[PDB]
Design a protein around this nucleic acid. Structure first.
Ligand SMILES: [Mg+2]
Ligand SMILES: [Mg+2]
Ligand SMILES: [Mg+2]
Ligand SMILES: [Mg+2]
Ligand SMILES: [Mg+2]
Ligand SMILES: [Mg+2]
Ligand SMILES: [Mg+2]
Ligand SMILES: [Mg+2]
Ligand SMILES: [Mg+2]
Ligand SMILES: [Mg+2]
Ligand SMILES: [Mg+2]
Ligand SMILES: [Mg+2]
Ligand SMILES: [Mg+2]
Ligand SMILES: [Mg+2]
Ligand SMILES: [Mg+2]
Ligand SMILES: [Mg+2]
Ligand SMILES: [Mg+2]
Ligand SMILES: [Mg+2]
Ligand SMILES: [Mg+2]
Ligand SMILES: [Mg+2]
Ligand SMILES: [Mg+2]
Ligand SMILES: [Mg+2]
Ligand SMILES: [Mg+2]
Ligand SMILES: [Mg+2]
Ligand SMILES: [Mg+2]
Ligand SMILES: [Mg+2]
Ligand SMILES: [Mg+2]
Ligand SMILES: [Mg+2]
Ligand SMILES: [Mg+2]
Ligand SMILES: [Mg+2]
Ligand SMILES: [Mg+2]
Ligand SMILES: [Mg+2]
Ligand SMILES: [Mg+2]
Ligand SMILES: [Mg+2]
Ligand SMILES: [Mg+2]
Ligand SMILES: [Mg+2]
Ligand SMILES: [Mg+2]
Ligand SMILES: [Mg+2]
Ligand SMILES: [Mg+2]
Ligand SMILES: [Mg+2]
Ligand SMILES: [Mg+2]
Ligand SMILES: [Mg+2]
Ligand SMILES: [Mg+2]
Ligand SMILES: [Mg+2]
Ligand SMILES: [Mg+2]
Ligand SMILES: [Mg+2]
Ligand SMILES: [Mg+2]
Ligand SMILES: [Mg+2]
Ligand SMILES: [Mg+2]
Ligand SMILES: [Mg+2]
Ligand SMILES: [Mg+2]
Ligand SMILES: [Mg+2]
Ligand SMILES: [Mg+2]
Ligand SMILES: [Zn+2]
Ligand SMILES: [Zn+2]
Lengths: 245, 91, 49, 104
RNA sequence: UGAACUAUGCCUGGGCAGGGCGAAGCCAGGGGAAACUCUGGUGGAGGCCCGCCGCGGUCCUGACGUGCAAAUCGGUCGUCC
RNA sequence: AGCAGUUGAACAUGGGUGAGCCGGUCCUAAGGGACGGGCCUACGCCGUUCGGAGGGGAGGGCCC
RNA sequence: GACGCAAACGAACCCGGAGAUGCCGGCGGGUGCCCCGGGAAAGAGUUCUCUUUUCUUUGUGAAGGGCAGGGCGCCCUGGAACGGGUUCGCCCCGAGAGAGGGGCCCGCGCCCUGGAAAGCGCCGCGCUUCUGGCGGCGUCCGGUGAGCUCUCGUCGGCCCUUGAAAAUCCGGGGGAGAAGGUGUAAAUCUCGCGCCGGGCCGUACCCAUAUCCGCAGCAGGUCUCCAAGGUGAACAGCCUCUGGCGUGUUGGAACAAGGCAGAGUAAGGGAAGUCGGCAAGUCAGAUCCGUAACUUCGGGAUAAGGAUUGGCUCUAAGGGCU
RNA sequence: UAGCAGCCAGCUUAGAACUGUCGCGGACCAGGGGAAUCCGACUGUUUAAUUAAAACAAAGCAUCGCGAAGGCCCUCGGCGGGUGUUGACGCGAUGUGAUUUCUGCCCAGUGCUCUGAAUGUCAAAGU
RNA sequence: UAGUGACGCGCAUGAAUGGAUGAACGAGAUUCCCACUGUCCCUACCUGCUAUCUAGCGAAACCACAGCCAAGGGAACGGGC
RNA sequence: AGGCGGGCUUCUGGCGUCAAGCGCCCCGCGGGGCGCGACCCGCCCCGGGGACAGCGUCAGGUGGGGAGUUUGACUGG
């Protein structure tokens, strides 16, 4: 047979991202002496819509401490901020919405967003619209903390990872039901070439391990092992259980 | 005055998409297009510009709020929770 | 087309000068051995690419 | 009624292939290619939606041949900031520098 | 060795008569004790309808079938913000 | 030139395209593709704003 | 005061603007075209009868100066409820309306320089390869429109769609520096004018029922711009003017059968034909009435089912300006 | 002062009389209709050159993997590359196919998955 | 022998290998009714372009030799014996 | 690779650019330079893992994702 549609997505020919009209990479300010021993003042200039995601981005303009220049940072717009307000990033920053203070200096039960996995990566966890991570507990002995990622998994990260307080804007976006296939067409036309998903049973055995047969049955257990080769690993990969639940 | 008994704004979809689906989009298309009172000027001109973006036509204040409403119910409870955690952090 | 490059226009100039008929005195010089140019091309029948 | 044609190689209705009808001294109606409309400058404040006043609305490279007085006003931030946001910057700078005296 | 055809994606341009039903919003006049209702007008929404160019190609299993054509022609027909 | 022709996009002999202000040239879009580095037994390939001691313009009379 | 004056020093560095933003809808300004009124001028057509008739022609470039017109969350005075202003729709106002007086922007419209000398229209004379030249007169006065396009504005609508980069150009912040000591100097965003230069390449023609592709002058295929009069809702169909053409690789004489097509027509019956209402036949626009079962209350629906329609002569209602 | 006079300007609507052979959307343009069954919800897409459909897609619904030293996938190769200018309201892999109403019993078989050196089988190296 | 409504020990219906239902929608499959019509009873007539004839021009598939039948025999259906 | 290890900015959609000052020194009232201002010392730029990931090479399991091939004969077809 030939290669399945899933194998062709790794080549990156027509399945690359559509990043022409995107406004940049949303990431926190790189950690420097100002964010380690104090705080830096920044002004929110504009809240723009990034084509491809459901969460707005804020263009916060800080002041460079070593040269006469004003840096522009493209943050994740936490729900509640507005243009013209001041955002303070650093250790000594107060516990307000929008500020970027390390998780080690936050009380237990804080709602953060754009959390950092490791110190310096400029914000990875809890970055989609309406999502957040809660700080569960601290540990001054091992300099570690425990946060609750939006997937429900409790991850143990360092106490120096910075995060934006407050939930991400654009919450409740998945509540409005898409009514037309055209709204789903324009939804993915800005993300990537992945929308029309042809079922494996609707294909021939050459293109998919589920195709073929005078009926449209699967014919084999859809639950597939994890060590299955690329080309066979379709359906339910390493399914611990199935059913309605 | 009233030209539609039940549909209202979703009458633009006709007989398509079903009854229960058109009932759920109605409560959202109303709050999505409605103009809210600007908390910085008092003028009811806070209309939604993009997904999660709310702009005012008088003071030009852009606020990052909910997708279909001005402020989601989750963000209101968080803002009051952060204000409570901040007070106990100092004292 | 009307928008040509210098190399293409220089290539069409040579093919235009090669498409000339054989001189009359060549026929009498060769004793009617070379009577007609065997490489005459027509703009409708043969295309030069 | 006469049906006139284009006057250049470009035969499409692009953003630069814009024309207008003009009546020549020879009692004809021919196309006359116009330049794209310019835009007056905006305020550097990023708040006021209206454009600036007292400034020509031409193309960028046309501003090279204009005189300086045709490109700004005689105010402090003239040509780059509106008058309403200048007087607010003056009051904001004065009042903030006054609170920093009370603290001492 | 080929994406001058075609399949999908990207960048940058161009194009799509005339009509029909007519949603939110708004104005006015009536009914009410409040909840709130009724009539007219306005407004111009839609993978909405008839439909030209366009783009497609149903039926006649028509014409043609050493053809105009190694897939075309006519009527009819689908769709046309 | 599927009849003809005193005709032709045929044949023969000559002639014809003139720019500072029309377009190319100039710019980067998708994208292609060097440089550093890595890889390949190799011809070479991967990769594209990242990565090398990657700065050969500006100013004060030798500074930056 | 918005901001205006012909100019009106200024580095590093910084900030900002323009380049540079979608689709759709409504409205308004301007051109082009069309139309109407001159019982307008110059030629032509018609005249058997009528026709102060019918047809054609009646002009201004870029750039600059001035003025209409359009737009403006631009300024000053002032202060609003008996709320007022206002759009087709909206929208606007104590974060300051209405009103009065100003400022700026766009002006592709009109006048002027250009510029009538030229271009068209008409008439006369000279001349027949210098001849293939010289003269005369005219190029006028208004109207509007649910008209059609183009364009500039303006107010909206839609998006789980937010609808490009860079060269290049400009303004501001900044005050490092430079200029002369009593008439000039530094510096001038030509600031009025003058002087010199602008190389290289493409440029003919066809652009499609004979200049491209399909073996061809192949009923196929191939990206765009301009686009008139009448009927009509129409860029539908039918007819006409400008422009183009000879019927699409041939003429002549016949009108048998049998074909293709004209979606030719038909007595009485009306699907009995046939696998099957295949085929084509009925219906069809518009106005006024009238529209069920069912339904997700949106629809069904142009449901179904009726009436009216020409021509001619009148009447009534719907405007603007002084 | 229950507004009038003068002038100008079009294009529509309604009613009435009269009239021709009861003919009048006169050519042209231009839906036959109704009662039901089957399938697909709809719009869209598809076998260029015999199949335009009940097939594909679809929104909705549901399951599955993965917190980045990761899930899925590419390359002969660089711990190179795609999703990723991404971060669970996300990406990847499947089935069903709008809305309404429901979705029962079976984990023995196959398959997936978890538990574990606490007992069998058990390679290379080491002893 | 079709269509529809019922009956169900159903060779071999059945619940997201989704069951039941369904307004609107369909160049999807099927049945009946009204109107309509040369589909038919049962064919006839007219017209355009051809066929036909003529001037000019002028191919191709095909072809063992060829071309009247009955019966007989024969490789069990001859054109030839 | 902008402040690591050891002994001074939260009231506003302003402003912040090569140092004012002080000390000392060198030239022709005019110039220039140095130090403090801007603490001292040091071994890795700063963080997160760390002899575990990973790499090279054998071994076992899994492996229709992919490759090669086979899939008897007789026979009232
Ligand atoms: Mg199949
Ligand atoms: Mg199968
Ligand atoms: Mg199925
Ligand atoms: Mg089975
Ligand atoms: Mg050719
Ligand atoms: Mg156009
Ligand atoms: Mg477009
Ligand atoms: Mg309908
Ligand atoms: Mg069509
Ligand atoms: Mg067509
Ligand atoms: Mg097709
Ligand atoms: Mg056809
Ligand atoms: Mg046929
Ligand atoms: Mg035939
Ligand atoms: Mg011939
Ligand atoms: Mg000739
Ligand atoms: Mg020749
Ligand atoms: Mg552009
Ligand atoms: Mg654009
Ligand atoms: Mg508009
Ligand atoms: Mg006012
Ligand atoms: Mg300046
Ligand atoms: Mg030419
Ligand atoms: Mg021809
Ligand atoms: Mg006949
Ligand atoms: Mg016939
Ligand atoms: Mg009959
Ligand atoms: Mg019969
Ligand atoms: Mg029968
Ligand atoms: Mg039919
Ligand atoms: Mg019906
Ligand atoms: Mg049934
Ligand atoms: Mg059936
Ligand atoms: Mg369908
Ligand atoms: Mg086909
Ligand atoms: Mg499933
Ligand atoms: Mg299906
Ligand atoms: Mg089940
Ligand atoms: Mg089991
Ligand atoms: Mg029957
Ligand atoms: Mg039955
Ligand atoms: Mg069963
Ligand atoms: Mg079963
Ligand atoms: Mg079944
Ligand atoms: Mg339809
Ligand atoms: Mg269909
Ligand atoms: Mg049907
Ligand atoms: Mg369809
Ligand atoms: Mg024989
Ligand atoms: Mg195999
Ligand atoms: Mg084989
Ligand atoms: Mg055998
Ligand atoms: Mg035997
Ligand atoms: Zn406001
Ligand atoms: Zn401003």
């Amino acid at each position: 047979g030939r290669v399945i549609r899933g194998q062709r997505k790794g080549a990156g020919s027509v399945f690359k991202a559509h990043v022409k009209h995107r406004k940049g990479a949303a990431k926190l300010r790189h950690i420097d002496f100002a964010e380690r021993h104090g705080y830096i003042k920044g002004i929110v200039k504009d809240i723009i819509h990034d084509p491809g995601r459901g969460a707005p981005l804020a263009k916060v303009m800080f002041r460079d401490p070593y040269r006469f220049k004003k840096r522009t940072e493209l943050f994740i717009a936490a729900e509640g901020i507005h243009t013209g307000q001041f955002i303070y990033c650093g250790k000594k920053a107060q516990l307000n919405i929008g500020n970027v203070l390390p998780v080690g200096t936050m009380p237990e039960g804080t709602i953060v967003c754009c959390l950092e996995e490791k110190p310096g990566d400029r914000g990875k966890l809890a970055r989609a619209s309406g999502n957040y991570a809660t700080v569960i507990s601290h540990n001054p002995e091992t300099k570690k903390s425990r946060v609750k990622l939006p997937s429900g998994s409790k991850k143990v990260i360092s106490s120096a990872n910075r995060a934006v307080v407050g939930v991400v804007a654009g919450g409740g976006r998945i509540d409005k039901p898409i009514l037309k296939a055209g709204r789903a067409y324009h939804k993915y036309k800005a993300k990537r070439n992945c929308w029309p998903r042809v079922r494996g049973v609707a294909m021939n055995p050459v293109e998919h391990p589920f195709g073929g047969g005078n009926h449209q049955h699967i014919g084999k257990p859809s639950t597939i092992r994890r060590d299955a080769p690329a080309g066979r690993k379709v359906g339910l990969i390493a399914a611990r259980r199935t059913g309605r639940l | 005055a009233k030209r539609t008994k039940k549909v209202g704004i979703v009458g633009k979809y006709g007989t398509r998409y079903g009854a229960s689906l058109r009932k759920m989009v109605k409560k959202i298309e109303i709050s999505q297009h409605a103009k809210y009172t600007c908390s910085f000027c008092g003028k009811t001109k806070m209309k939604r510009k993009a997904v999660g973006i709310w702009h005012c036509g008088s003071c030009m204040k852009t606020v990052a709020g909910g997708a279909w409403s001005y402020n989601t119910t989750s963000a209101v409870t968080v803002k009051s929770a952060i204000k409570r955690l901040k007070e106990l952090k100092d004292q | 087309a009307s928008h040509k490059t210098f190399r293409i226009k220089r290539f069409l100039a040579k093919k235009q000068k090669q498409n000339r008929p054989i001189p009359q005195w060549i026929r009498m010089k060769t004793g009617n051995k070379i009577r007609y140019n065997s490489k005459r091309r027509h703009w409708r029948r043969t295309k030069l690419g | 009624v006469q049906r006139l044609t284009y006057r250049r190689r470009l035969s499409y209705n692009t953003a630069s292939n814009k024309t207008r009808l003009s009546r020549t001294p020879g009692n004809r109606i021919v196309y006359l290619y116009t330049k794209k409309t310019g835009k007056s400058p905006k305020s550097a404040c990023g708040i006021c939606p209206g454009r600036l006043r007292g400034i020509r609305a031409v193309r960028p490279q046309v501003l090279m041949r204009l005189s300086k007085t045709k490109k700004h006003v005689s105010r402090a931030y003239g040509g780059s900031m509106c008058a309403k946001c200048v007087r607010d910057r003056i009051k904001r700078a004065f009042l903030i520098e006054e609170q920093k005296i009370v603290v001492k």
